[model samples]
Target: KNIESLFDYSAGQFEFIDHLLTMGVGVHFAALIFFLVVSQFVAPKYRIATALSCIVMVSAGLILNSQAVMWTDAYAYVDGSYQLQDLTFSNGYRYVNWMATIPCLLLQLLIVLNLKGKELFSTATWLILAAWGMIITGYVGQLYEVDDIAQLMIWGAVSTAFFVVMNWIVGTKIFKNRATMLGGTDSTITKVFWLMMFAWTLYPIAYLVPAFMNNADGVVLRQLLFTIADISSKVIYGLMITYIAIQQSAAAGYVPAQQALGRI
Candidate 1:
């Protein structure tokens, strides 16, 4: 209102992103609270996983809040497009958040899947590196100056291949082996894994949407799609992880000491 006295204003770009981010912060913060508070009720063997997930949820909230502020105030929109810097202000921080969270996301799954010893460490190392590779290349492709469509396609393709590799390692190899070793536990794990895979598969498509179709109208569509993916991957998937923890506790015939004492 005060600024309106000095200059006439009309439509604002990035409002959709702003709204989405505002809502996202609340959702992610709720997830963080669930992970932190509900974790105590989980069995001892699974508590640490929930605690780590809480951290990731909080981290995502903070990153998303920062993105909301940065996007709203730092960049100017002209002719329905954002002004560019050395790095595109709109997406650079997002990729940074992805890079940080993806590793922790996979780590949570590794814990839930009951990976152990050298297997856990090795898989974690590879998954983290693979996730980093995916995000780093994807980030480069998102740069406003990268006009060579073929080059962008190549980077997206390679990053997608890494994604497939990650899925295969967990969804195919580890999951299959676990099914055999753990028997009926595989069914539950399989469902959860596929749920995540399906949600995750949409991300590359969402990412490529703006590149493939250059239109102002598609901007909000892209953000909406990505927001859906984020919620699915984090909150919905986090709930699934908690389910797995509960299942693990039950299957192990392990009762929380409090439960045994009738306190729970």
Candidate 2:
């Protein structure tokens, strides 16, 4: 791998990335509004779950905004061609965003599932730790993508191991909690769990893209995949969780959630 090669894309080549990055920021910002406005609709017991969604939206929106800047700012017009300056565009930002928000997203699940304090503490501790294991290892592996395929494969496999462990933990928790969650929330909550997994599945797919194709085209492809993964995992998944929480609140006879449903 020629590690010295830097990003050299024409403005036209960069347009798609600008579209995805800026649009992604807008979606997440809009979702923050939705999470906050919808906050008043859920019962007090479920408010924390909704608040977690708010955190997810805010983190993504702000980080993506920063990434949008980094993408543009990293380029310079040298010899009448745009090339990278000292500021290199880094995917590390994406993983960092995940490191912060992914744990909060999982916390939403335990909250909506109505896990008690002791169980929440233990389950969240393991779940969050495994999540960091998965992300940090993957981030480290991502560093080797362009230079050391062997290291990438080894670290990637280690990260995947953590992923499997995470799924085992969360999947089992969802199953156990399903039997105990309020009757009306069973289907939606489980549905959201699988959807969350589905969204997360895309990140690995995007990660593998560079292995097969390493160019501006592949970079664009990866961004699109991540775009889909982020929206579904954060925004759509958040909405589903909020919906289930509202359903649980309504089932428990909370008037606000019921009236919000009636307006639908």
Candidate 3:
């Protein structure tokens, strides 16, 4: 169902998608408020992580909102049936959002790791390139979802390779840093890593949806998977890092972090 939103839909399916998209919008905006307000409380050094969280929320919320709007506009009622219009749903929008959000996610990871030396920028640079490769390759594959299975599997496998590279290096980096991560924050950093892997794993599942189930029902499931994945990866993922950032500050005996958590 690789975003095949250009087909006829039953009333139930349309409503389901409408609910999920709007729900995504609501959740993202809500988290946005939390990040901005909380940013003032963490130590200044950790604000960058929280700020990145805010940016992710702002962009993710807007994109989901646009999806909701476009979903409504992409359909028309005629003869008691709603039909998705041609060229109404753009798959590229999802990738564009990912292009911004995913790299920022990695940047936040860097801050939490306290990597400020040459390794910081170098790791960030490498992760960004890998993330772009993963996303862009997947985008190309999904474009041929319904039309070409060979292309989908080929490009999708390539995209998966990029993800594995990201996952492997990040895991190894985390392993090496467990001994060095901000004291008392090992669990938090590990949690962020596992949560990232768990949440992002769904995206490849979504990409595989069209090949296995190209029906209308498959479309609905794919959208639902993506919506849920987005919330977990972006909103929930960022929250965990923000929490650790505050804790990292608290570990450093920062007054603001102490006051924020009422440890004063």
Candidate 4:
């Protein structure tokens, strides 16, 4: 519990992180094009970089965003230090962000289970799981020390990585190759991924107004925003989890519905 004079032990961690942030944004901006182009390819081997790059890019975003929040002026709501998830969640987008994690994690599981390439599966699994653990640990920290937004955003990062994977996996695996799977794109898994992408896009724009329009007085606008955000988030995330289970169920031909969807 020594809160005194913390040192930046690993400057290289930060330097590499900054470099990745530059590439991550560049890659993420081109995400949709990448997904579409890669999906149409016959060589599953080539699709590897898109999937892996997405994970790296999204992770970098989370790290950067997390770091941004560490500084002052992270958002309009708070003026003092970088600590306010409770306040942030109360403002609305937090719940949407939280609920979105489900589909995101689902997409992750799918990618891991279906890798035809290298040891990417084991690596992706450990990476995502570790990120998820950091997310939960961050949540506990915020619960005790600050508010909800910080932890929620980290999880948002976690889910966003999950989202990128879904886009990559479903587009590449389910939609493209009938030669690979039985029922093909019409299969439950592929359909789920497609539908879930459409579903998840809802929360981003829908919740923005309330987030920004809030008056300095209270959380009225924030609360309203949070409510709307939560709905879109829950719907999309549910679709996400369903997409995963549908694929899982189809592949395993078993596994209880809830359990499959809620797999860790």
The CA lDDT of each predicted structure is 0.69, 0.84, 0.84, 0.38
> Who is ahead in lDDT, 1 or 3?
3
Clashes of 2: 0
What TM-score should be assigned to candidate 1?
0.82
For candidate 2, the per-residue lDDT at 256 reads 93
Q: After superposition, how far is residue 17 of candidate 2 from its true place, in Å?
A: 0.1
Write one digit per residue (lDDT tens) for candidate 4, span 1-264. Answer: 111011121333333433433443454335524444433321332333334334433543443344334322222222432232321222122332343344344444345245444544554455455445433433333332223444534554554665466456446655454344421324544545555565455443323322333222112232233233323333333333334324434345333423433563
Which tens-of-lDDT digit does each residue in 182-230 have in candidate 1? 3155666777788888778777777676566555445556667767887
Candidate number that wins on TM-score, 1 or 4? 1
- Give candidate 3 regions above 4 Å deviation: 1-6
Q: What TM-score would every model get versus the actual structure?
A: 0.82, 0.94, 0.95, 0.33
Model 4, residue 251: what's the lDDT? Answer: 48
- Rank list by TM-score: 3, 2, 1, 4
Which parts of model 1 are misplaced by more than 4 Å? 1-14, 75-88, 144-146, 180-185, 257-264
User: Candidate 4, residue 18: CA error in Å?
Assistant: 41
Ranking by lDDT: 3, 2, 1, 4
Clashes of each: 0, 0, 1, 6
User: Could you tell which candidate, 3 or 4, scores higher by TM-score?
Assistant: 3
Q: What is the lDDT of residue 212 in candidate 3?
A: 88
lDDT of 2 by residue, 133-232 (tens): 9999989988887888777788889999999999998898888888677737887777887898889888888887668777777777788998899999
